[PDB]
Write a protein that binds this ligand. Sequence first.
Ligand SMILES: NC(=O)c1ccc[n+]([C@@H]2O[C@H](COP(=O)([O-])OP(=O)(O)OC[C@H]3O[C@@H](n4cnc5c(N)ncnc54)[C@H](OP(=O)(O)O)[C@@H]3O)[C@@H](O)[C@H]2O)c1
Lengths: 319, 112
Amino acid sequence: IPHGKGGRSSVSGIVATVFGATGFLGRYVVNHLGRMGSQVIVPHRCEPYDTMHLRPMGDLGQIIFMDWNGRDKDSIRRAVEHSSVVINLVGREWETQNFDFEDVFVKIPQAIAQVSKEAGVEKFIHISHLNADIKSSSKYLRSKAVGEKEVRETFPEATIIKPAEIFGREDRFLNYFANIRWFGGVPLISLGKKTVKQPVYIVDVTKGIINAIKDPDARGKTFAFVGPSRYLLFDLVQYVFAVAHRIGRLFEISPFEPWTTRDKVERIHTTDKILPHLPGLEDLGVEATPLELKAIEVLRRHRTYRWLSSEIEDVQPAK
Amino acid sequence: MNLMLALLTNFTLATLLVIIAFWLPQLNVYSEKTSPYECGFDPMGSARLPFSMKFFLVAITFLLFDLEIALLLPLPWASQTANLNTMLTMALFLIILLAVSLAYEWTQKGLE
Ligand SMILES: NC(=O)c1ccc[n+]([C@@H]2O[C@H](COP(=O)([O-])OP(=O)(O)OC[C@H]3O[C@@H](n4cnc5c(N)ncnc54)[C@H](OP(=O)(O)O)[C@@H]3O)[C@@H](O)[C@H]2O)c1
């Protein structure tokens, strides 16, 4: 039950449990739950120090930390016992040299679709992507579609979310570009055919959740997040170099956290603008943010003062 | 032929330890905030380097006292010599010729 103003130090009824919550997507969620105030039980894998910038979000006794491996059952059956909602965003990029990567999107969202489901939770939420299609792409992009399909068997009403591609503040998607101060700028693959996707702004995706977390009546009704205005061009890569003007890893360096001479060069250019009958963002209101307002901020190289911004795009066509 | 391999050892050991200390953990996998906070305690400082007169005259004055020590430099080689009344009375000239250049400027230095 709620009480008083929801500024800080209130009760607000909900008791979430947000798995992951260290990466760019999982962290920025917990910031908006350390405002309205709630028992946001965040468990973390193996990181004592790398989670320290998360503590001045929970007021005093709001958040709480636990350690958990993920494959073992009861390590994720001990935190899910006292909860109201539980959302999932676990996962990564490329296959690691210890794990198997196949069932990690199959058994592990099912390992927390175990007695977690039975114990009395509600509003269990998973994530998707706008390009995860069971047609022959990719090793990561499909086998996420296994997680769309093989985990849908349990919890027949979830509101699994299907956000668009994200541009943000500390992300990897747009930041994979303009970090290519290198012996050449090679696009994918010297072509501007299907560029670009829908770069939704990360504040909207973390505002969609917290409007769905007490919506009500949003269970089973999966959602797909609208992007900015409107499609975009290959001019994006030219626009990135327009204004730019050309955790827990190791002690010295981690010798393998690469740029992946594999599927990753084409894990983003397979676009597949999916079904526009999905409800999917504006009805999960209210949020609609462009790119050309929030583009100055995260792009940051050695000029640092002089921008003189005028670069834009028409729509582009098929708008 | 080691003079010249007496120093190219010393500089390639010098440039070795720089790139290993600097550039090798510069490729590490931390968060690495690139925000413009890297300058300390003089945040913006929206000005050009202003001229300071009392810190220009210190440059020129040294340069004109630096020349005639190289004239004064071959005094130990001017010992094992011929006619030495010339050698003594000319060696005393340059020092006084350096000394007067003090005393004229010494009546106006400024807060140096
Ligand atoms: N919606 C989108 O547009 C989009 C884009 C890219 C990726 N994704 C996927 O959607 C989620 C977004 O995550 P993100 O953007 O914050 O990047 P992220 O680096 O994948 O962060 C997600 C967290 O999951 C952790 N993790 C990886 N393997 C794990 C395992 N076996 N067990 C427990 N934790 C594990 C990661 O490292 P730790 O174990 O150290 O915590 C990380 O902290 C991820 O699942 C991601 O693969 C979505």
